[PDB]
Design a protein around this ligand. Structure first.
Ligand SMILES: O=C(O)[C@H]1/C(=C/CO)O[C@@H]2CC(=O)N21
Ligand SMILES: O=C(O)[C@H]1/C(=C\CO)O[C@@H]2CC(=O)N21
Ligand SMILES: O=C(O)c1nc(CCO)oc1CCO
Ligand SMILES: *C(=O)/C=C/NCC(O)CC=O
Ligand SMILES: [Cl-]
Ligand SMILES: [Cl-]
Ligand code: NA
Length: 277
């Protein structure tokens, strides 16, 4: 037992769930670790917008470009029929939008068009892949823009991660090992000031728990398979410490609300273990 009855407890919970669920927990201040179903590749869906914002913010820090500089977005780039509050605000495109505003839409509101704008800005999906790899985090594949993921069903499975790689990226980011102080502060606040995934990592946590996170979601095909239901981020414990956590519910046959409950229950049991010192 110890941190092992916790792993065995999560495995027991996953036994009857028709899905492949990956889990990873990394203490921030204290060196706590937990893995469930780790040697597997889970599609990231919109969670990889976190990695993109990192590459964006790093490019700004390094080239000394202000997050306030404006980018001209062509109307042809605000694609329709994809989630994009940017397009809904500026339906005619051909507009100068600050990188700050585009980041906000991409991270806090999961803007697909904002995401693809920001991929163009850093030089494409492969540039983001290199940036992550050069940080010393392995087993993250970043190959498809949001536009490419909305084509064939298979294409989302080519943006994949291990759960371990995510918590490693989260904790590097949180301990301010990646970005300038101003860039760190900005991305953190956009990950706190989100309304997404209310029933995921946050669902069963006490009221007022600080949760900086990024969700991702996919469709359900006609054999009832939801490819990806995800939530990842950093959580504050009652004693003021933090832990990074990622839950990837992949290729689920379960109903949608069950898929989020899986994230919520798993995170809740981790929350209870760590709340006991
Ligand atoms: O001491 C604590 O507060 C928690 C914790 C939090 C993660 O930094 O990590 C260690 C493992 C555990 O229960 N401790
Ligand atoms: O098709 C596109 O790429 C662009 C463009 C100019 C081409 O550089 O003009 C229109 C506005 C828009 O979205 N289109
Ligand atoms: O727009 C959102 O709030 C959002 N959230 C997710 C992850 C699943 O909750 O994806 C999106 C964009 C469309 O999928
Ligand atoms: C952000 O999580 C992505 C949302 N939509 C992606 C798709 O619709 C692709 C699923 O087939
Ligand atoms: Cl273009
Ligand atoms: Cl409460
Ligand atoms: Na999302």
């Amino acid at each position: 037992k110890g941190t092992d009855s916790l792993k065995s407890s999560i495995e027991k919970y996953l036994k009857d769930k028709k899905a492949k669920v990956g889990v990873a927990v990394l203490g921030i201040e204290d060196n706590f670790k937990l893995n469930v179903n780790e040697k597997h590749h889970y599609p990231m869906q919109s969670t990889y917008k976190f990695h993109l914002a990192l590459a964006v913010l790093d490019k700004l820090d390094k080239e000394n470009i202000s997050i306030d500089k404006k980018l001209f977005v062509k109307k042809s780039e605000l694609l329709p029929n994809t989630w994009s509050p940017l397009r809904d605000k500026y339906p005619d495109g051909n507009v100068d939008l600050s990188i700050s505003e585009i980041l906000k839409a991409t991270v806090s509101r999961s803007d697909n068009n904002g995401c693809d704008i920001l991929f163009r800005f850093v030089g494409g999906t492969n540039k983001v892949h290199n940036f992550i790899s050069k940080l010393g985090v392995k087993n993250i594949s970043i190959k498809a823009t949001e536009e490419e993921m909305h084509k064939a069903w298979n294409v989302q499975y080519t943006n994949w991660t291990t759960p371990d790689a995510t918590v490693q990226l989260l904790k590097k980011f949180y301990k301010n090992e990646i970005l300038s102080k101003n860039s760190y502060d900005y991305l953190l606040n956009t990950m706190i000031e989100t309304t997404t995934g209310p029933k995921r990592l946050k669902g069963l946590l006490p009221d007022g728990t600080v949760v900086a996170h990024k969700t991702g979601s996919s469709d359900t095909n006609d054999k009832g398979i939801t490819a990806a239901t995800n939530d990842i981020g950093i959580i504050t414990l009652p004693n003021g410490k933090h832990f990074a956590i990622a839950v990837y519910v992949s290729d689920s046959s379960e109903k949608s609300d069950v898929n989020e409950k899986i994230i919520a229950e798993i995170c809740k049991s981790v929350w209870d273990y760590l709340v006991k010192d």
